[PDB]
Amino acid sequence: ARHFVLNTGAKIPSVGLGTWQSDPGVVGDAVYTAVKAGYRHIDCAKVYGNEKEIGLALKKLFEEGVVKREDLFITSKLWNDRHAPEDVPEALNESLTDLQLDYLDLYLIHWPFRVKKGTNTSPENFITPDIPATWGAMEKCYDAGKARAIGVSNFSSKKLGDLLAVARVHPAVDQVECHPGWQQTKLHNFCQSTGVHLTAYSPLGSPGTTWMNGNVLKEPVIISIAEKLGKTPAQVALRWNIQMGHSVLPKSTNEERIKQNLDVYDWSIPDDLLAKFSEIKQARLLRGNFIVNPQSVYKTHEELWDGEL
Ligand SMILES: NC(=O)c1ccc[n+]([C@@H]2O[C@H](COP(=O)([O-])OP(=O)(O)OC[C@H]3O[C@@H](n4cnc5c(N)ncnc54)[C@H](OP(=O)(O)O)[C@@H]3O)[C@@H](O)[C@H]2O)c1
Ligand SMILES: [Co+2]
């Protein structure tokens, strides 16, 4: 249960450390602790700013012989201001430099949304996306060896299919919000039919993000399953995703919960309990408001998510 296989043949560890919202000093400690506890998968993103810090933790892990580089699966993400084809490999090079790596295992287009290089998400910065042109540049970084796999994040079934249709190198991953409160069944089936792996971000419902209002680990179905199996709600939530065949990116800074989030491998949710997940109310928590706008290509949330909301 410990790995899934991407359409490139490479194995992605089923659990990775999320690092969204990890401040100065804290993220390196979490990455260090997660890897010694046994994590082999670290999910990063340039837009979080903390890649230099992550790189220093990885450098310490390598030097202490905790792991070798080829033991680790490192992901980073191309931010919305580097979609232009000429900017794509430069952005990757900057993420590589900050992380002190020669290659990423996975490079993702962060959002199907573009702004002018070096500007912020404001309506006077909006450029109409050209995913095919951007993907072409992602493909060259893959061909050059800088990214062992390339993929996307926050892509609907439609948009993922529109990219598969034009692509030479298939996206290896679609990383999306996915948890018992937002189970992504449509996208799940579509990935299965296309060979795209689905990585679950916010696999716990991001309890610690104020503006999302996530109380997923509080659904009675999860609590009930948690005590009949003798596991935390988190473990049950994570295990649910793994049993759906998805990798999960639990984010945490507490050492004990980091270890608990890895203990989702050698037990199962029985069939009769798993059926109960169809009873959980479904609501998308990361709605994408910041790119829904009268001047954006997505004027409604439906246009961003193509109905899956
Ligand atoms: N591609 C994208 O656009 C995108 C968007 C969002 C996230 N992501 C990626 O996916 C990762 C995960 O999503 P997320 O950070 O939004 O939220 P999440 O992992 O679902 O939940 C994080 C929150 O849950 C708490 N928590 C962690 N382990 C727990 C446990 N065992 N029991 C109870 N509570 C626990 C954490 O606090 P403690 O630190 O105290 O444990 C933290 O406040 C991110 O870190 C990021 O790498 C990607
Ligand atoms: Co093809």
Written in H, E and C, the secondary structure of the chain is: CCEEECCCCCEEECECEECCCCCCCHHHHHHHHHHHHCCCEEECCHHHCCHHHHHHHHHHHHHCCCCCHHHCEEEEEECHHHCCCCHHHHHHHHHHHHHCCCCECEEEECCCCEECCCCCCCHHHEECCCHHHHHHHHHHHHHCCCECCEEEECCCHHHHHHHHHHCCCCCCEEEEECECCECCHHHHHHHHHHCCEEEEECCCCCCCCHHHCCCHHHCHHHHHHHHHHCCCHHHHHHHHHHHCCCEECCECCCHHHHHHCCCCCCCCCCHHHHHHHHHCCCCCCCCCHHHECCCCCECCHHHHHCCCC
Any idea where the domains of the chain sit in the sequence?
1-309
Atom 27 (ligand 1) nearest CA: 252
Give the separation between CA 194 and CA 217, rounded to whole angstroms: 31
Residues labelled as active-site residues:
48
Strands 73-78 and 106-109, sheet pairing: parallel
Phi, psi angle pair for 174, to nearest 5°: -120, 105
| Tokens, residue 37 | 């506890």
Torsion, CA 132, CA 133, CA 136, CA 138, rounded to 10? -100
Could you tell me if the CB of 74 is within 6 A of ligand 1? Answer: no
- Name residue 55's amino acid: G
Number of the ligand closest to the Cα of 7? 2
Closest CA relative to residue 286, chosen from 219, 221, 204, 217: 204
Q: Cβ(199)–Cβ(105) under 8 Å?
A: no
The Å distance, Cα 95 to ligand 2 centre, comes to 28
Resolution (angstroms) equals: 2.4
Q: Which atom of ligand 1 is nearest to the CA of 216?
A: 20
- Are the C-beta atoms of 52 and 25 separated by less than 8 Å? no
Strand partners, 152: 109, 174
User: Which residue has 């049950």 as its token pair?
Assistant: 236
Query: Of ligand 1's atoms, which has the minimum distance to the CA of residue 204?
Result: 20
Cβ–ligand 1 distance for 276 under 6 Å, the answer no
Question: 237 with 203: CB under 8 angstroms?
Answer: yes
Tokens of 143: 């061909």
Residue 115 structure tokens? 């702004």
**Is 204 part of any known ligand binding site?**
yes
Nearest CA to ligand 1 atom 7: 201
Question: Which experimental approach was used here?
Answer: X-ray
Distance CA 293, CA 309 (A): 17
CB atoms closer than 10 angstroms to residue 303:
13
Q: What is the C-alpha separation between 27 and 74, in angstroms, rounded?
A: 15
Inter-CA distances, 218 with 180, 184, 307, Å:
11, 19, 27
